[PDB]
């Protein structure tokens, strides 16, 4: 019978966040939304203590949580069991983009509204995917290692060092992030750009890439839709995952699909870790069939023993692994965007106007409100 609770789970930044106000996505700085939440008579409970269910600080504040705020880089998994003891939950907001860590179906069954700050990090992840591509293709790991450990073995680096130019790049998903990856690839003079999704790209999108290809490289018709998944990964040197975890996309990048790729190919996954068969990825990196890079993991924070943390090609420890901890969507520039985004969503809710941006809505009124989840 207390005040209504806003329960927010973010990662902790300690003294770093206390001295860097731009680290808004931290428990310390609370996205800057404390004044607003208290202006409207709500109790703001912010915590980084999100696991051991059901003993966490997060779990213990579920019974009076009206609004739940999470963040994908350090995500409180809002499962059916947890939704079942949050009886007055009305709204879930993701501080960022990516809401697979909710049980969206159980939330619909309760009429729960689910919002994201769609578009706050689309450019940031696209930069991360391009960086990953460049790091793997050009063998930055061994090139940096040679400089770090005092030697000068040019041939060890160059033996696995390829240009981006004249490679074939394929993307599973040409949405906001996927398409933005294609855009930044054009000036690298690819041999061909492939894409695979359930609907064909718009025309002016195909025309924009072809126009860019013509201006930069004098090449035309560089983009092409492949409709068979095995056919897409067979033709490509580099495949990026830029689609969502939507149930039948569970584990789609499995042992068989990896086997259909050329030996020495590259897999980038800044989308969702669970799109892959995680051990099949590790097997294929450690065998040298592929190199792998990305920042999303199947379980976050990732276990110490997670096989992706020690994957490498046979050539050496610094060959073929460009993993990072989940950071692309939470650069300082991105954090400013989605902190302001969470503030606008809460303002609309508190003022009881609910004039949300429609692209921000993931679930509402008991139904999905987007193709990005299901």
The CB-of-130 to a second copy minimum distance in angstroms stands at 7
- Dihedral of alpha carbons 238, 239, 241, 242, sign: positive
Asked if residues 276 and 311 have their Cβ atoms less than 8 Å apart, the reply is no
At residue 251, the 3 state secondary structure works out as coil
51 sits near a second copy (criterion: CB under 8 A): no
Alpha-carbon distance 186 to 231, whole Å? 22
The CB-of-372 to ligand NAP minimum distance in angstroms stands at 4
For the chain, state the CA radius of gyration.
22
3 sits near a second copy (criterion: CB under 8 A): no
Residues in 87-126 at the binding interface with a second copy, rule: CB under 8 A: 123-124
- DSSP class of residue 187 equals G
Q: Could you tell which of a second copy, ligand NAP, none binds residue 11, using a CB distance below 5 to 8 A set by kind?
A: a second copy
Each residue 324-363 as x (binds ligand NAP by CB under 6 A) or -, in order, gives: ----xx----------------------------------
Please report which residue ranges of 186-314 form alpha helices under DSSP H: 203-217, 229-235, 255-259, 278-286
Among candidate residues 322, 270, 275, the one with its CA nearest the CA of residue 296: 270
The CB-of-139 to a second copy minimum distance in angstroms stands at 7
Residues in 188-217 at the binding interface with ligand NAP, rule: CB under 6 A: 196-199
The residues facing 199 across adjacent strands are none
The two structure tokens encoding residue 260? 């259909």
Residue 272 known to be catalytic = yes
Each residue 88-107 as x (binds ligand NAP by CB under 6 A) or -, in order, gives: ---------xx---------
Nearer to ligand NAP, 272 or 289 (CB): 272
Among candidate residues 137, 141, 138, 142, the one with its CA nearest the CA of residue 156: 142
From the candidates 82, 101, 326, 337, which is the catalytic residue? 326
Alpha-carbon distance 335 to 23, whole Å? 7
Asked if residues 144 and 168 have their Cβ atoms less than 8 Å apart, the reply is no
Residues in 33-62 at the binding interface with ligand NAP, rule: CB under 6 A: none
Q: Could you tell which of ligand NAP, a second copy, none binds residue 135, using a CB distance below 5 to 8 A set by kind?
A: a second copy
The CB-of-65 to ligand NAP minimum distance in angstroms stands at 24
Q: Could you tell which of ligand NAP, a second copy, none binds residue 243, using a CB distance below 5 to 8 A set by kind?
A: ligand NAP
Q: Which residues are known catalytic residues?
A: 121, 272, 300, 326
């Amino acid at each position: 019978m207390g005040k209504p609770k806003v329960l927010m789970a973010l990662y902790s930044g300690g003294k770093l966040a206390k001295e860097e106000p731009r680290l808004l996505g931290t428990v310390e700085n609370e996205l800057g939304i404390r004044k607003l939440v208290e202006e409207h008579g709500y109790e703001l409970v912010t915590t980084a203590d999100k696991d051991p269910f059901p003993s966490s600080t997060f779990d213990k504040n579920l019974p009076d949580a009206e609004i739940i705020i999470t963040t994908p880089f350090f995500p409180a998994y809002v499962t059916k069991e947890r939704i079942a003891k949050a009886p007055k939950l009305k709204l879930c907001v993701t501080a960022g983009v990516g809401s697979d860590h909710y049980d969206l179906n159980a939330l619909n069954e309760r009429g729960i509204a689910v919002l994201e700050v769609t578009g706050s990090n689309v450019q940031s992840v696209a930069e991360h995917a391009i960086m990953t591509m460049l790091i793997l293709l050009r063998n930055y790991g061994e090139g940096h290692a040679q400089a770090t450990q005092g030697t000068w073995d040019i041939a060890a680096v160059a033996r696995d060092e390829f240009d981006m130019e004249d490679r074939v790049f394929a993307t599973i998903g040409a949405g906001r992030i996927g398409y933005r990856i294609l855009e930044r690839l054009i000036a690298f003079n690819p041999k061909k750009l492939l894409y695979y999704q359930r609907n064909p790209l718009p025309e002016e999108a195909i025309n924009k890439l072809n126009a860019a290809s013509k201006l930069f490289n004098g090449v035309d018709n560089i983009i092409e839709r492949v409709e068979n998944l095995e056919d897409l990964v067979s033709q490509a040197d580099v495949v990026t995952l830029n689609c969502p975890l939507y149930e039948k996309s569970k584990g789609m990048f499995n042992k068989e699909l990896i086997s259909k790729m050329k030996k020495g190919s590259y897999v980038i996954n800044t989308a969702r870790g669970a799109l892959t068969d995680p051990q099949a990825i590790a097997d294929a990196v450690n065998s040298g069939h592929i190199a792998y890079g990305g920042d999303v993991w199947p379980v976050q924070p990732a276990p110490k023993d997670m096989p992706w943390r020690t994957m490498h090609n046979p050539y050496g420890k610094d060959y073929g692994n460009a993993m990072t901890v989940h950071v692309s969507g939470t650069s300082l520039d991105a954090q400013a965007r989605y902190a302001n985004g969470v503030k606008q969503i809460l303002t609309e809710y508190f003022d009881k106007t609910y004039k949300y941006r429609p692209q921000d809505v993931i679930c509402i009124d008991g139904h999905y409100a987007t193709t990005s989840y299901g």
